[PDB]
Amino acid sequence: MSEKLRAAHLLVKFSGSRNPVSRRTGDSTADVTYEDAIKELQKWSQRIASGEVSFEEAASQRSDCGSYASGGDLGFFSSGEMMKPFEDAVRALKIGDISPIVQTDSGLHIIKRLA
Numbered sequence: 001m002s003e004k005l006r007a008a009h010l011l012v013k014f015s016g017s018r019n020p021v022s023r024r025t026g027d028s029t030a031d032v033t034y035e036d037a038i039k040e041l042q043k044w045s046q047r048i049a050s051g052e053v054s055f056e057e058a059a060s061q062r063s064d065c066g067s068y069a070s071g072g073d074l075g076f077f078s079s080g081e082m083m084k085p086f087e088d089a090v091r092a093l094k095i096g097d098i099s100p101i102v103q104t105d106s107g108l109h110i111i112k113r114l115a
Contacts, residue, residue, distance in 0.1 A: 006089050006115035008055050008073035009047075011065035012041045012108035020044040029064075037103050037108050041101055045110040049098055053113055064107065073114050084109060 013022035014037035020030040024040075032040070044058040059072025067074055080087055089099035089111050093100045098112040 003078045004076045004115075005113065006074065006076050006091060007111050007113050008059065008071070009067060009086070009109055009111040010041065010044060010055065010059045010063040010072060011040065011067075011104075011106075012062065013064045014107055017107040019064075021023070022107075023068045024062045024064065034108075038062055038101055041108045041110060045098065045101060048112070055098070056110045062084075076080075076115070085109075 012024070014034050015030040016033050017034065017074070020028050022029040025095055040062070044053070044062055047053045048055045048058055056073070057070035060068050062073055076089050079091065082090065083104055085104055086109055089102045090113060093099055093113045095113050095115060099110055101110050104113070
């Protein structure tokens with residue numbers, strides 16, 4: 001029951017990740033690798049978890065995905081409406097839970113369930 005979900009996600013792009021331009025670089029993220037990207041995502045995913053910054057604060061600046069202008073959080077969607085490894089993580093956490101560094105087609109993600 002209840003197919004509708006709400007979640008917040010961050011997206012990091014890296015040199016060669018199909019699209020070498022992040023909202024965090026604006027021009028190109030072709031200088032940062034998947035390692036440097038994980039190095040970065042793991043810090044924001046850390047701070048968001050530790051309480052240094054909120055997902056919103058990190059996402060709006062760092063996330064290359066359109067949710068940068070939304071606060072990282074998305075609206076309501078039907079379970080399975082996202083990406084395979086993305087939704088895999090979303091279902092793997094409840095409200096208030098954040099997922100470990102999950103890579104995707106075009107880069108890196110961390111997601112937390114809002115509802």
